[PDB]
Design a binder for this molecule. Structure first.
Ligand SMILES: NC(=O)c1ccc[n+]([C@@H]2O[C@H](COP(=O)([O-])OP(=O)(O)OC[C@H]3O[C@@H](n4cnc5c(N)ncnc54)[C@H](O)[C@@H]3O)[C@@H](O)[C@H]2O)c1
Ligand SMILES: NC(=O)c1ccc[n+]([C@@H]2O[C@H](COP(=O)([O-])OP(=O)(O)OC[C@H]3O[C@@H](n4cnc5c(N)ncnc54)[C@H](O)[C@@H]3O)[C@@H](O)[C@H]2O)c1
Ligand SMILES: Nc1nc2c(ncn2[C@@H]2O[C@H](COP(=O)(O)OP(=O)(O)O[C@H]3O[C@H](C(=O)O)[C@@H](O)[C@H](O)[C@@H]3O)[C@@H](O)[C@H]2O)c(=O)[nH]1
Ligand SMILES: Nc1nc2c(ncn2[C@@H]2O[C@H](COP(=O)(O)OP(=O)(O)O[C@H]3O[C@H](C(=O)O)[C@@H](O)[C@H](O)[C@@H]3O)[C@@H](O)[C@H]2O)c(=O)[nH]1
Ligand SMILES: OC[C@H]1O[C@@](CO)(O[C@H]2O[C@H](CO)[C@@H](O)[C@H](O)[C@H]2O)[C@@H](O)[C@@H]1O
Lengths: 436, 436
């Protein structure tokens, strides 16, 4: 395919090299005549292993060239990848300056082009950027309309500097933000041979995925460092500790714990976080990230409370009370906390939990339930149908499979607040999720 | 084996069921008459799938029993597991109250026994607890010596409530904290049949591993929730976003980013963290964890500075300047930041980086290197041997393979500050790690 790439930096030069190596005819575009001149000499503008060879190969086969003539580039290509910078503004916000300039240029360029052109944003931009910035600018400069006249989509990159070519060749996945199907199909064709999933999503999901990947990488580093600092302070090797953590692919390096939802609770996570951070404090080890967990957690409880109390009714049914489905353990259950908040605010609360109800009859926790939290346990209702019938707002609190039916076919006149993820789709007038 | 278990709660009751089901003679000890009575009836004190059957089986076969008689329990077993509570004190610190009484009880019971007994702590306790609390109390009350007269070890548990039996049967790994070899060997024999690695470390490392696992789990949930909250605010399904994150087993769900070391940097992580948190703030989405990353990161830079300047010399050699080995990219490099801190405080700094040295004269970043940061780049030295010979403190800043030789064969009269992990072992008088 004929392809134009806007921006020949750390990302764009690699893409240019990798695409031309696969047989595409690539025209690199940059405002920097320094970078353009190097590329036309088969020279890498950066230190990146293997890049110079790919650029050399591209010039020799006539499949790679560099230019500042953006109009010609667009006229001579089927698709333009935007790979320009999105640096921070002074205040930390996303600087759209370069994206804006390129969009105007591309719009001017396609104004009289009679073949359908396609624009693909590889640069990392926030959700909303394509709708509110890219499309309007291109549409205003071209006199054409997105979709029918020109294709638009996003295609984030996951390359790491120093291993960019290997990362391109063997990525974890290809992510496509799709508006019109033609562009999505075009991108699928370009990446089709890679051994990784092609994931097509809305533009907004695609961009959120990119940011989430990068912030996750940052969170991982930060976690390893804070733990490392604590380990050193207690006289052990932080690398040894993290090495063992990384041998666990069931809980540590799996998708478990990675579902957006409600606060964590139970008899161990809260106390163990408090104890480790307490010890770190005693040892003069600052730990901003580890020290933020409990506050964030409490914030999530408040968030659920705010969703529940936003409905002009006092009749709340709480589905689940112990900290997890399948256990009766009430210790530091966020659902108990939520229940107590509701009771404190005068709500008419009914609660269903088959595990806790069972525990009132069989088990060693009867005294806790009847004497320690009587204000809450007295609100237990043994019949799920009754909780549903007599409540207006139903809160899906933990993962009991018995709550599935209620979500699949909700009686009329009820509002659901989903803290776990039972909902098949996003928030509607009758059902709202805490993170969807 | 003959095993006694102290504490028949959520963890202990499960261990009692699973050990007796494997053919061991198990004597469960608790101060709660309620729990003991239930065990003796073959009844579960808790709602935990499959547990009651195991307890029934243990009573039927005559392998399981419960008692408050701690002395007799110890006399009639060869190993005691401690599974008592370790709840928070009011201040968030670890409450050692239950472990202290159990240690005294066990200590008095072993005084009454000539044969060698073995004590294994399964309860989650902070690094240092076994050496500073458990051992002294057992020794004091028994008048005997740890390791020599009685076996001592730790064996953290990784069980989740509601899936505890499945987790016992199919754990990610078995972790053993070891003092005397006999106890380590005994624990290995108990867990040999399981399909998972057996990891034997010092007691402190074992204790640290357990905490790190739980705080990691807490961090995972918190990350998912904060991202979810942002996702909902931008009109997207947070679950859809995280589902895609979890499809990446190369960067997201791998060990990459999980090594303790230095601050993250480069042209993308910092700016993307800043942009996402900025947007979250605009959308009134609180995000304590995500909002803590940059501060923790800057703290790590300060930590390195502190180690470097602790040596009473001004001659510093910095090995690595760009943000990663194998690239010349200086954008938001933590090593450049560190260099500037050192220059600002009057240090005699020499810098080695083969990539920046190359880029300074070939490529597209020359003007930045020569005109923007000459106060740093002018300190570049071509010969690694020269930076080494002329400096007193050498800082291992990024992962260049060239630095390996310096670490394995360090010339006399140097102090190494390892920010990466080149050191084979922990901190010594001549070499210190940022997290080891
Ligand atoms: C990812 O990839 C994107 C690029 O990152 P990077 O590290 O490669 O950035 P980089 O700064 O190394 O490269 C960006 C390139 O875009 C070029 N550019 C700016 N405006 C342009 C325009 N009007 N037309 C053509 N080129 C233009 C710049 O000259 C520069 O070479 C970012 O969004 C990042 O988050
Ligand atoms: C892990 O596992 C450990 C136990 O957690 P859990 O959730 O099972 O707690 P849990 O509260 O459910 O069980 C702890 C048990 O230990 C018992 N206990 C307290 N002192 C005792 C003693 N002197 N002798 C015998 N038993 C005693 C309690 O009565 C209780 O049944 C914790 O360290 C946790 O972090
Ligand atoms: N302490 C520590 N730091 C680490 C570790 N692993 C990496 N780092 C650091 O994390 C930073 C970023 O490195 P890396 O992610 O390897 O490279 P890069 O920043 O070029 O790539 C990331 O941004 C890309 C991008 O947005 O363009 C992404 O595409 C890419 O996937 C990465 O997330 C660097 O400061 C690293 O030193 C670790 O285990 N421990
Ligand atoms: N939001 C969200 N919450 C989650 C997710 N997965 C689990 N949770 C929650 O995380 C909390 C802890 O649950 P879990 O770890 O499944 O069970 P438990 O707390 O019994 O076990 C943990 O502590 C044990 C222990 O110390 O005894 C550990 O052994 C064990 O591995 C766990 O870390 C609960 O509040 C859960 O609801 C998720 O994907 N998203
Ligand atoms: O150490 C000698 C003695 O120990 C036994 C068990 O008591 O074996 C243990 O130690 C061996 C050597 O380290 C290990 O290979 C083995 O796994 C462990 O049980 C006896 O086999 C031996 O006589």
């Amino acid at each position: 395919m004929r392809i134009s790439i806007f921006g020949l930096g750390y990302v764009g030069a690699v893409c240019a090299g990798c695409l031309s190596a696969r047989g595409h005819e690539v025209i690199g575009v940059d405002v920097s005549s320094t970078k353009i001149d190097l590329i036309n000499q088969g020279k890498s503008p950066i230190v990146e292993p293997g890049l110079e060879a790919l650029l050399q190969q591209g010039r020799q086969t006539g499949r790679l060239s560099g230019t500042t003539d953006f109009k010609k580039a667009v006229l001579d290509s089927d698709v333009s990848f935007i790979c320009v910078g999105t640096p921070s503004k002074k205040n930390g916000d996303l600087d759209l300056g370069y994206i804006e300039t390129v969009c105007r240029e591309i719009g001017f360029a396609i104004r009289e082009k009679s073949e359908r052109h396609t624009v693909v944003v590889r640069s990392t931009v926030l959700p909303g950027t394509v709708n509110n910035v890219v499309i309007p600018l291109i549409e205003d400069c071209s006199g054409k309309k997105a979709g029918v006249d020109f294709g638009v989509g996003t295609n984030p990159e996951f390359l790491r500097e120093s291993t960019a070519i290997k990362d391109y060749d063997f990525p974890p996945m290809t992510v496509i933000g799709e508006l019109d199907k033609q562009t999505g199909d075009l991108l699928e064709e370009i990446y089709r041979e890679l051994d990784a999933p092609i994931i097509r999503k809305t533009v907004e999901v695609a961009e959120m995925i990119k940011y989430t990947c990068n912030v996750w990488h940052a969170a991982k580093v930060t976690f390893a460092n804070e733990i490392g600092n604590i380990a050193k302070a207690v006289g052990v090797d932080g690398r040894e500790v993290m090495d063992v953590i990384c041998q666990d692919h069931k809980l540590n390096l799996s998708r478990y714990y990675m579902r957006p939802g409600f606060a964590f609770g139970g008899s161990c996570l809260p106390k163990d976080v408090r104890a480790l951070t307490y010890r770190a404090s005693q040892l003069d080890v600052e730990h901003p990230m580890l020290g933020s967990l409990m506050r964030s957690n409490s914030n999530q409880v408040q968030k659920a409370f705010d969703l529940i109390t936003s409905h002009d009714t006092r009749k709340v049914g709480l589905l689940g009370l112990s900290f997890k489905a399948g256990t009766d353990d009430l210790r530091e259950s966020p659902l108990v906390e939520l229940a107590e908040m509701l009771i404190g605010k005068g709500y008419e609360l009914r609660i269903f939990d088959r595990n806790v109800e069972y525990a009132r009859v069989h088990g060693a926790n009867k005294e806790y339930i009847e004497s320690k939290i009587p204000h809450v346990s007295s609100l237990l209702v043994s019949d799920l149908d009754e909780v549903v019938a007599s409540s207006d707002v139903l809160v899906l609190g933990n993962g009991d499979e018995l709550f599935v039916d209620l979500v699949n076919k909700t009686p009329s006149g009820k509002k659901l607040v989903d803290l776990v993820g039972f909902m098949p789709h996003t928030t509607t007038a009758q059902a709202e999720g805490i993170c969807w």
